[PDB]
Amino acid sequence: AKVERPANVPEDRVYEIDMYALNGIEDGYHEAWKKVQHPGIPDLIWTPFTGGHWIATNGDTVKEVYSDPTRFSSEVIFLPKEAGEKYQMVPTKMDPPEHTPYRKALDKGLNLAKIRKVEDKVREVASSLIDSFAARGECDFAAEYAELFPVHVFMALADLPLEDIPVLSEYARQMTRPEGNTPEEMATDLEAGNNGFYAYVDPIIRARVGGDGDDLITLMVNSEINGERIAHDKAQGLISLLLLGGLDTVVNFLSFFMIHLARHPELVAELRSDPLKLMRGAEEMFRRFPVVSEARMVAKDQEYKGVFLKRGDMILLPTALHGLDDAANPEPWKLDFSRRSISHSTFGGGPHRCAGMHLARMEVIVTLEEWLKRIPEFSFKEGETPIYHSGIVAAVENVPLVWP
């Protein structure tokens, strides 16, 4: 399903790239994106796949598109456009100034200082999951840690009974990874999850208004937007985005770095010997394993990167192409915990820059600490290979790990 080349796209910028099926995906998500970014590739290219869209191809251009809501709007942030148009969320769809009060509400539950207080609960999630299989000498990391860890953290931050994990996990799967052989069946799957989650938190929102708790739900529902308490449905959208933001990004991120560490025993030893360098190299991991490739909509007609972009045009942002850009970071493939200038867009940029980034950093550091306390050496099961997918959030599964 290819679209005709528009008059604003120069023929010499056309690349046949399908963001949902990159060539060579089966050798690695990051590898597949990097093989797109050949030497001398224009800053902005264009593909007829996925409705037809531009693609930012380096760190400089990814950074720039993220930073400027005036020129590149969040009105549509994913591809294809007709799906992204149809599936907006609060406040990822807003530009400033509308966005601002909603981000302020988000920041109440996610700021650096608030996240510090939550470390004990996160650590306890990490240690319990790990304690399940540490004695076994083997596990599927994706299935037995990565897929479970985020939902458990959410329960703790949102103050929700742990026995609701099964129903919330079901809704999570449907909301983050819809299935369907028609876009209609896919639409059904998404609705199941979105409305199911809505029904689930609805009585908790109501019970928590005027409440004294410092969980995520009470913090969102008692936020003020423009001088008055946040609308019921807006608080619902926030709480939903809080579940979502912290799920698929982390599930997959965790596996990508555990895979690499399985295959790099000498880095594992390094981190084991130096827990200050462990703690301080979360940032290097974020650079090396980006997972998001969402989009911006061109907000108005304009010249950019030597082309004329039309209002309504879409620009795909492969965050892999900033972290792994050797113009941005010399020798980018090396996971280097002493790296001096760690340049990346793994959490976006501009006003929407991941509100969850302090939590992300803490989840990663704590996972790595708890893991190494119990499993100081490990590797990838012989004869096995991960399975990769490309899309809005990179997917990896099948991560059999083994240890003495």
Ligand code: HEM
């Ligand atoms: C590896 C971990 C993570 C990655 C790579 C990641 C990535 C991103 C990116 C690229 C954005 C910007 C979206 C845009 O501008 O359109 C974002 C936004 C957001 N993330 Fe994260 N995220 C991660 C973890 C988390 C966690 C743990 C949470 C906690 C729930 C979270 C919650 C959010 C929220 C609420 C936003 C929207 C902020 C806004 O629009 O102002 N994320 N994330």
Ligand SMILES: CC1(C)[C@@H]2CC[C@@]1(C)C(=O)C2
């Ligand atoms: C995965 C997303 C594209 C979607 C909107 C922003 C993003 C990073 C999320 O937090 C959910």
